[PDB]
Design a protein around this ligand. Structure first.
Ligand SMILES: CCCCCCCCCCCCCCCCCC(=O)OC[C@H](COP(=O)([O-])OCC(O)COP(=O)([O-])OC[C@@H](COC(=O)CCCCCCCCCCCCCCCCC)OC(=O)CCCCCCCCCCCCCCCCC)OC(=O)CCCCCCCCCCCCCCCCC
Ligand code: FES
Ligand code: FES
Ligand SMILES: [Zn+2]
Lengths: 49, 58, 100, 76, 188, 281, 56
């Protein structure tokens, strides 16, 4: 869940499934998480609301 | 559709799907086109009579 | 000759027998390592190996780790969990994918 | 309390089968409750439980939603 | 069509099995081939029609495969990951997982990377009856599942027989011979 | 043009303009502590399921060998592959897929191997193949969750580490038409969410592809020994069999432990208070 | 400007490759509109020379 205070969208960066050995899963991929439905990062499948 | 698999001399493998109507048989000498609907590149048993050349338009 | 069973994962299929093996090996190791303390104490499934205030002893737990490794043929990661009771030992043994 | 352990295993197997049939998928973990001892959350070692020895093995589908009926019945 | 049908009576077909054999003969988990026949064609084709073909037995990926006693055909082609066997000390009665895929970072053993690659090669979980030094296969092609049966020698010979492998080995040999020639002519 | 605007000059009603009664306060406190309160968000994963559908099978209509063979022939040309796989065959390979989806997939430019693979993925993950890729969302997928809500998930268009290269648009088009002088218009910061390790879930979004590329770059220049030349039926290892080895002592000990009245019997003292204890020394 | 990535900077999965390939083929087909097909183009190129002194 990514929160916005009454704003229709927010920039969200995804680094995948973070692990202990390497603090990030994959490369920092940015997108514009919008309001209305679930959206997911096609690189790692992480669903953002 | 016919799937054609070939291999280069360095071990690379190539796959190509080609429509059946693209095939045009060549003659035994491969100098001229061979007549479709009448051409004998398979012997009586059913195996290749000679090295058959086929031209593909695309 | 008794042929060993083909089906794998028999340790997870018999929780009671696994707990009995854990209790036996832990009891033997604790009576050998610390006879003055554990030679009179029956070791059951609810028995823990901490102080009356919940403080754990690393030496006793590492002895129990060695006992479990030798009994079940596993490699217990000592840095991830510390066996302070029979329940923790049961969880560790049943979590491993190659106990035998 | 061995009954507690066996009932938890049975309940979580039924829940996995039910959720997999609802979602038209398969379970992701096969571990009833997630704890960090296997590091399966961030490593590549799964806790999947599918063991069989041949194509005729009756126990091939144990642990998979194909083992349950559409009524979430344990057998077949 | 007519010309083909004229000679179609005398034509003889040949089997499609070449240099691969039968998987079910050399490998469990693979049911023997079954000839499935289509049902009658549907009278009306609807946009939401799922297939009516007879169902096919579906074998899931096993978590690991047992030790097949000298009869092991890899489910998929593995990465060679070395043409030399490891000489590993195995303890008696301890369960070992042998890497079949070959991409494991943890030497001959499975680690967990078979789940992170598209392959049907599952680890061979085996147990030895006596502790000692064993030749664990590292080319992942041995008929003995976790042990070496000198198949890597055949693999090396086949690699040398190939045109590109022949060129590679001769290029390395000529590089070494150039070094040797320089060392021999160092005083001219 | 519109005139000046000061929103602070107009009343807003966020707080009731009257004060509660004392009796109402007491009754409300009693009532709210007589019933359970609304739940608060819990982030534990209860029964995780595969995000990419069922895991591919060892044997069946579609297996992993098909996926590998798909990998080794990747190309993105400037023209279609007008060779169309039979929709009946696509339906057979992926049994649950419908006729319209198979036909539409055949009407795309993928080679037949990629057509069947794409049909498999689209059916398993619930992908909507009729969704046209744009710079808002690259894909759409309708999936029913564990509560049976039949939600939809929109795969967004992404950028590689560079918000400057991100197409911040609100149109189903590929062009970059909108140019914003103020990227964070309302001063709300962007976010890079950190994931708690304890709350992670095992990777199930096509987890079997993480090393794929690497392996496929090593097997392209590898020559494999044909099964006609690979030795087979070699002698079995003397100390290994298909059944995992158990010592006869261990089997006997398990047989003894099957009994309900089992106790170690090797202790120096009668710690289990067993009536049939004989001191072993 | 149109980004060359089509919104898929990384092909971490093969589904991303499929989506990119489909959108790329549609985009190229839309671009190649008003440009004649291969047969007509070859006909125009081959029959370009229309300057002959003697006709039948
Ligand atoms: C040191 C070794 C010693 C032992 C050698 C044993 C045999 C070795 C060869 C075995 C086969 C290996 C694989 C070959 C390529 C296969 C791939 C392929 O598709 O190829 C088609 C491919 C065409 O492209 P493609 O198919 O579209 O794409 C390639 C693949 O898809 C994809 O392929 P790729 O991209 O993965 O690979 C790319 C690579 C692929 O190519 C290679 O890997 C080849 C590497 C070198 C091979 C050298 C050995 C040649 C073996 C035959 C010799 C016969 C000798 C006996 C008969 C004649 C003499 C009597 O391309 C190159 O290397 C670039 C071209 C290099 C040309 C080197 C020319 C050397 C000339 C030497 C003589 C002149 C010296 C003075 C002048 C110097 C300046 C020119 O061709 C090439 O890429 C290779 C071109 C060169 C081939 C002919 C070489 C002739 C050498 C004559 C030497 C004469 C010496 C003097 C006389 C001595 C006697 C009196
Ligand atoms: S079986 Fe080889 S990496 Fe696991
Ligand atoms: S490494 Fe020797 S046969 Fe495999
Ligand atoms: Zn991601």
């Amino acid at each position: 869940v990514v929160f916005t205070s009454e704003t229709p969208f927010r920039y969200v960066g995804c680094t995948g499934q973070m692990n202990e050995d390497d603090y990030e899963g994959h490369e920092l991929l940015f997108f514009l998480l919008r309001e209305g439905s679930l959206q997911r990062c096609m690189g790692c499948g992480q669903v953002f609301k | 559709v016919a799937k054609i698999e070939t291999q280069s001399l360095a071990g690379d493998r190539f796959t190509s799907w080609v429509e059946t109507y693209q095939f045009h048989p060549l003659t035994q000498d491969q100098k001229n086109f061979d007549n479709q609907d009448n051409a004998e590149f398979l012997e009586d048993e059913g195996q290749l009579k000679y090295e058959l050349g086929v031209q593909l338009d695309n | 000759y008794n042929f060993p069973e083909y089906r794998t994962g028999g340790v997870q299929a018999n929780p009671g027998i696994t707990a009995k093996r854990i209790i036996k090996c832990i009891g033997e190791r604790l009576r050998k390592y610390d006879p003055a303390r554990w030679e009179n104490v029956p070791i059951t499934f609810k028995t823990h190996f901490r102080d009356e205030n919940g403080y754990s002893d690393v030496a006793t737990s590492i002895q129990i780790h060695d006992a479990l490794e030798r009994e079940f043929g596993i490699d217990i990661k000592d840095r991830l969990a510390l066996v302070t009771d029979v329940e923790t030992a049961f969880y560790i043994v049943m979590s491993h994918h190659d106990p035998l | 309390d061995i009954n507690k352990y066996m009932e938890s295993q049975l309940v979580n197997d039924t829940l996995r089968a039910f959720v997999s049939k609802v979602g038209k998928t398969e379970p992701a973990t096969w571990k009833n409750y997630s704890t960090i001892y296997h590091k399966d959350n961030y490593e590549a070692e799964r806790v999947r439980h599918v063991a069989f020895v041949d194509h005729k093995d009756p126990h091939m589908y144990h642990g998979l939603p194909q083992d349950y009926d559409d009524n979430i019945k344990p057998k077949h | 069509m007519s010309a083909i049908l004229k000679r179609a009576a005398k034509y003889k077909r040949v089997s499609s099995i070449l240099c691969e054999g039968e998987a079910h003969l050399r490998d469990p988990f693979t049911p023997p081939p079954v000839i499935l026949k289509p049902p009658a064609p549907r009278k009306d084709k609807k946009p939401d029609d799922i297939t009516d073909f007879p169902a096919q037995k579906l074998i899931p990926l096993p978590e690991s495969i047992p030790y097949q006693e000298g009869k092991y055909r890899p489910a998929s082609i593995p990465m060679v990951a070395g043409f030399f066997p490891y000489n590993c000390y195995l303890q008696q009665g301890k369960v070992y997982s042998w890497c079949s895929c070959g991409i494991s970072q943890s030497g001959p053993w499975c680690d967990g990377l078979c789940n992170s690659v598209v392959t049907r090669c599952r680890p061979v979980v085996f147990n030895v009856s006596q502790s000692g030094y064993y030749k664990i296969c590292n080319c992942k092609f041995s008929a003995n599942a976790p042990f070496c049966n000198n198949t890597h020698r055949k693999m090396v010979r086949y690699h040398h027989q190939t045109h590109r492998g022949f060129y590679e080995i001769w290029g390395a040999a000529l590089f070494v011979l150039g070094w040797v020639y320089m060392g021999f002519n160092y005083y001219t | 043009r519109a005139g000046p605007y000061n929103p602070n000059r107009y009343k807003d009603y966020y707080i009731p303009r009257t004060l509660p009664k004392n009796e109402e306060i007491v009754e409300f406190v009693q009532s709210q502590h007589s019933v359970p309160a609304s739940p608060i968000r819990n982030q534990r994963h209860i029964n995780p399921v595969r995000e990419s559908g069922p895991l591919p099978s060892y044997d069946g209509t579609y297996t992993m060998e098909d996926i590998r063979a798909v990998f080794y022939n990747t190309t993105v040309g400037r023209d279609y592959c007008y060779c169309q796989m039979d929709p009946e065959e696509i339906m057979r390979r992926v049994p649950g897929i419908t006729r319209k989806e198979a036909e539409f997939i055949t009407k795309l430019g993928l080679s037949p191997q990629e057509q069947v693979d794409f049909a498999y993925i689209a059916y398993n993950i619930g992908l909507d193949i009729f969704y046209f890729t744009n710079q808002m969302f690259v894909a759409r997928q309708v999936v029913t969750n564990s509560k049976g809500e039949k939600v939809e998930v929109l795969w967004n268009a992404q950028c590689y580490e560079d918000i400057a290269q991100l197409n911040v648009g609100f149109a189903p088009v590929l062009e970059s038409v909108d140019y914003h002088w103020e990227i964070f218009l309302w001063a709300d910061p962007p976010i890079k969410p950190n994931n708690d390790f304890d709350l992670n879930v095992p990777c199930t979004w096509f987890e079997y592809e993480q090393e794929w590329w690497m392996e496929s770059c090593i097997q392209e220049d590898q020559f494999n020994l044909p099964e006609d030349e690979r030795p087979y039926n070699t002698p079995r290892n003397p100390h290994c069999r298909k059944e995992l080895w158990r010592s006869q002592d261990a089997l006997q000990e398990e047989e003894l432990m099957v009994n309900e009245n089992w106790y170690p019997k090797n202790t120096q003292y009668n710690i289990y208070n067993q009536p049939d204890f004989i001191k072993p020394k | 400007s149109t980004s060359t990535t089509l919104g898929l900077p990384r092909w971490y999965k093969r589904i991303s490759y499929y989506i990119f390939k489909i959108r790329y083929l549609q985009h190229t087909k839309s671009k190649m509109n008003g440009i004649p097909g291969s047969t007509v183009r070859l006909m125009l190129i081959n029959r370009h020379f229309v300057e002959y002194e003697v006709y039948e």
